[PDB]
Amino acid sequence: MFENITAAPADPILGLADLFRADERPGKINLGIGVYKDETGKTPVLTSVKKAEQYLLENETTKNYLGIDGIPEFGRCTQELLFGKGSALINDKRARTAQTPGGTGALRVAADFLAKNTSVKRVWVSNPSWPNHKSVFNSAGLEVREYAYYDAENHTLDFDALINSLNEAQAGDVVLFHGCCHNPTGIDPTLEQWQTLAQLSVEKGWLPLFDFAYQGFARGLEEDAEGLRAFAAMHKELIVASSYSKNFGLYNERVGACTLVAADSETVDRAFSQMKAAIRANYSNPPAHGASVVATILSNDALRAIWEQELTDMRQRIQRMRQLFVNTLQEKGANRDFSFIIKQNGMFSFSGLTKEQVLRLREEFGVYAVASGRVNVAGMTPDNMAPLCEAIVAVL
Amino acid sequence: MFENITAAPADPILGLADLFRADERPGKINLGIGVYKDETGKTPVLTSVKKAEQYLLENETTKNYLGIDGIPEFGRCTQELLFGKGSALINDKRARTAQTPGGTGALRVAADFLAKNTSVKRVWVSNPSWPNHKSVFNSAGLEVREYAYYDAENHTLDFDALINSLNEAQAGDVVLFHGCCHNPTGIDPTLEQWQTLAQLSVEKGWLPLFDFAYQGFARGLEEDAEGLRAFAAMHKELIVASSYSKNFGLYNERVGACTLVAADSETVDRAFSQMKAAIRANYSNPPAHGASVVATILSNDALRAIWEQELTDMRQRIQRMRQLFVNTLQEKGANRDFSFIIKQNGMFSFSGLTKEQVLRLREEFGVYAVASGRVNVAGMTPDNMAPLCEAIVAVL
Ligand SMILES: CCCC[C@H](NCc1c(COP(=O)(O)O)cnc(C)c1O)C(=O)O
Ligand SMILES: CCCC[C@H](NCc1c(COP(=O)(O)O)cnc(C)c1O)C(=O)O
């Protein structure tokens, strides 16, 4: 049965981790995956996370099955993070949330749901976007079409091209939006553009599917949900796949959520039962640990406060790193002007490097970046900044 | 988009948990899901598990991504549990293991793998079997056909009917076998029958897919893998989906594994890369916690020893419970003879009750069993045994 199976090609992002580790050479620098790093080059477990974990160790009485949709308080907390406390979506019971194995798993169950209980056949993903978007959707049978987004020359959001591209999307089609910290460009629509996209969307009959994997990394928790909340004010139906991998440093525990919104409770209940049916044929119920950590930290005044501070420290460190990056590049001798890096949000920056340039950096300097020229700014430290910038300049 | 979505029907097994909890009445007894219970009616976290968890709390330095296939030592330990330490499958590097979100998730990734990189179109599942088997396979596009198994009259393995049913399966078809503790019958093939099934299988060109969710609950760890090991001695290719939910009481942490076996390392490597591609489009990488617990307990002499004893205590308690069950039924006034219950293995017993009988038990006595008449023996305690047996007799 397996004699003819052809070797699958490596993930441009994940296949990078293998090379990096298999690669010897001490000075090797890893700017691939979007994993946070502190000033020392380590990606530690948050203190608030350690505290919640000890709490669980002493207060956990059983490991009994968690229920299809996971932990309730977990679901309640995510909806408030996403829509705000007052929110009518919460008051009218228009939304239902399922705990999932990461944001990747939230996207898959969303795909599985749509492809089986809906008439959707195509999903629109920005160009560029997280490579794995296509794969998740293709696996569910949906077709992936792309819309324009990045103005490479000026390094901005090419809104006209965006509108014009989406003009080809029909009613009943799914359009995927990154809530904030666009991967891999770092450029996001303003609130005006978000409202404009909301207006257009309700007229074209599109189903918005928001991917929120970096809430809190652009401006702040609440501010980062401004786009999403603008859509939710006008849409009767929307799906949101969110993650707690970055803002909670819970990468390997697979904590995410798929939030379903319908016109009213009765409908969302019906729609949700089918979603739970999609989870049951996939993994049964979700992993409790990482989610129990999130719910306990969020349900507790002191723990949440500590967490919120750790989060703003991560955001601020990245912000210092990109500024230092731009300056050291100039200081080091780079001809091109990289000031636009300072304008991007999140952990990355679209360096604007060519494929051969990223190939030489790795091969010749042990510096690891994604082929698209995406570099993880949160992986830059005051100590690796210099050899990194020298590598880059000698490749420009 | 969601206005026409029809409400999905409840899982015969999982939908039971809802009813049970939504049902008031103190004396209500739950014999539904296959979750272990101790003499007090609680399903506690194992001591060995608590010890490994404390170890992690103090020794864990990061929550950084785990890699597509999960923890290596985890994979190494499961292969030894499944095939034995000496095993040539291990020595020849013929097997590869991926850590997954439970045994359910191992079945799905197996399905996703086969349906996309193989020419399989149909999977054979015993009648009866775990209801969710059909759903997982149907979700991947494969077709589910059934083979005979249980001789309801004599309460035995109808091997002739089994052979005769499978005679309709073509070469290149997948046949699913329960490694031990057949769900829901509790009847398993002898080693002779296992070898016979192995012989037949290699001649008909079937791809064996073993579902191991109860290793250690029939006779013992090693003995329970006798069937599987007989197949592995003769087959060049096989897939095994195993779980650590019951034998480790890690239900809600989703710990399982999908083991791929091919003729040689080069082939399995090629086949495995595609499997990893199937995991990437589903959930990325697996949840670390429950798996780190399993690897730490298994890699440690003292912890493993404690775990092995906790496991044999669970097995033995169940064995005392079914014996008490049969006796109290006779003592209480049941006309029928239920001695065959004593012959079954695992947590359950196919009571042989009718749908209307299980309906009346619940509705009238608050006793919860699966419609098929499957009752969780590991949920019976010396204290609930009497009202339970009285409920049953007044329904016969
Ligand atoms: C999972 C490995 C990729 C990490 C990272 N992208 C992770 C990621 C996800 C989902 O990740 P989690 O499942 O871990 O929640 C969703 N959406 C975006 C836009 C992401 O960048 C990157 O390299 O950009
Ligand atoms: C998951 C809820 C069902 C529990 C139980 N069947 C669980 C179960 C599984 C997979 O379960 P995990 O994913 O939790 O590893 C695989 N195979 C069998 C034969 C099972 O009975 C039952 O009610 O029989």
UniProtKB/Swiss-Prot annotation, chains A, B:
Q: Which GO terms describe its molecular function?
A: identical protein binding; L-aspartate:2-oxoglutarate aminotransferase activity; L-tyrosine-2-oxoglutarate transaminase activity; protein homodimerization activity; pyridoxal phosphate binding
What's the top EC group for this one?
Answer: transferase
What InterPro entries has UniProt attached to this entry? Aminotransferase_I/II_large (IPR004839), Asp_trans (IPR000796), NHTrfase_class1_PyrdxlP-BS (IPR004838), PyrdxlP-dep_Trfase (IPR015424), PyrdxlP-dep_Trfase_major (IPR015421), PyrdxlP-dep_Trfase_small (IPR015422)
Keyword Nuclease assigned = no
What are its applications? Has been used to construct a 2,4,6-trinitrotoluene (TNT) biosensor strain.
GO cellular component terms listed in the entry, alphabetical order? cytoplasm; cytosol
> What residues bear N6-(pyridoxal phosphate)lysine in this entry?
246
Signal peptide as annotated in the record = none
Domain of life where this protein originates: Bacteria
* The enzyme's E.C. designation: 2.6.1.1
- Binding positions (L-aspartate): 34, 130, 183, 374
* Transferase found in the keyword field: yes
Q: What is its main location?
A: cytoplasm
Keywords tagged on the record: Aminotransferase, Cytoplasm, Pyridoxal phosphate, Transferase
Quote the subunit structure annotation: Homodimer.
Task: Provide the protein name.
Answer: Aspartate aminotransferase
